Amino acid sequence: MQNGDFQILDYTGLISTMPRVDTLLQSMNLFTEHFGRTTVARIERLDDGAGDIKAV
Amino acid sequence: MQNGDFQILDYTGLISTMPRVDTLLQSMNLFTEHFGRTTVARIERLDDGAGDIKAV
């Protein structure tokens, strides 16, 4: 590596830094992946239960 | 050994001591070594990150 016009110098190394990227949620694997075709999706719900019987 | 000029003495060997020499820091092998040619050294640093992609 070149120093001033009439002098030289020795290059040593490179230092690099980058912010951390988190992957905890990815690791936990709580999300299921679906590969569709369109840009619209449907979800179906069906809720059921029961009541109480009165004397007659 | 003789004493004065006509008597004798018993010799009890040598006694020697030396001061401390601490190598705890050196032993850990923390530092690295680089050998070059000139008297002036350069270093280079590179910083990189990421961006917050939005929806369009």
Side-chain angles (χ1 to χ4, degrees):
Chain A
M1 183 177 177
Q2 289 199 236
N3 205 335
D5 293 330
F6 300 113
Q7 305 203 135
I8 69 176
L9 66 93
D10 306 329
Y11 168 81
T12 63
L14 175 67
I15 304 300
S16 180
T17 73
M18 271 305 118
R20 292 294 306 277
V21 65
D22 211 341
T23 178
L24 174 61
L25 278 57
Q26 294 81 337
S27 77
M28 271 175 298
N29 286 271
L30 303 185
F31 283 79
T32 61
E33 306 201 13
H34 302 304
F35 301 158
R37 307 202 174 213
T38 72
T39 58
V40 182
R42 268 201 178 155
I43 308 97
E44 181 66 25
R45 186 179 295 276
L46 167 59
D47 52 302
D48 181 32
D52 76 301
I53 312 183
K54 279 181 160 200
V56 295
Chain B
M1 301 165 58
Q2 304 96 303
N3 206 15
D5 206 6
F6 301 98
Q7 321 190 2
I8 48 169
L9 300 179
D10 287 326
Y11 187 87
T12 181
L14 184 59
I15 301 292
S16 52
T17 77
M18 294 299 291
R20 279 206 201 205
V21 179
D22 209 315
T23 74
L24 160 58
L25 178 56
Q26 314 205 300
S27 64
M28 290 186 287
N29 197 0
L30 194 70
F31 275 84
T32 57
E33 312 196 18
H34 302 264
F35 300 96
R37 289 178 163 150
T38 186
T39 307
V40 185
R42 268 206 189 151
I43 310 99
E44 308 197 348
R45 172 183 264 250
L46 160 58
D47 293 329
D48 188 13
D52 198 35
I53 189 167
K54 287 201 181 193
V56 187

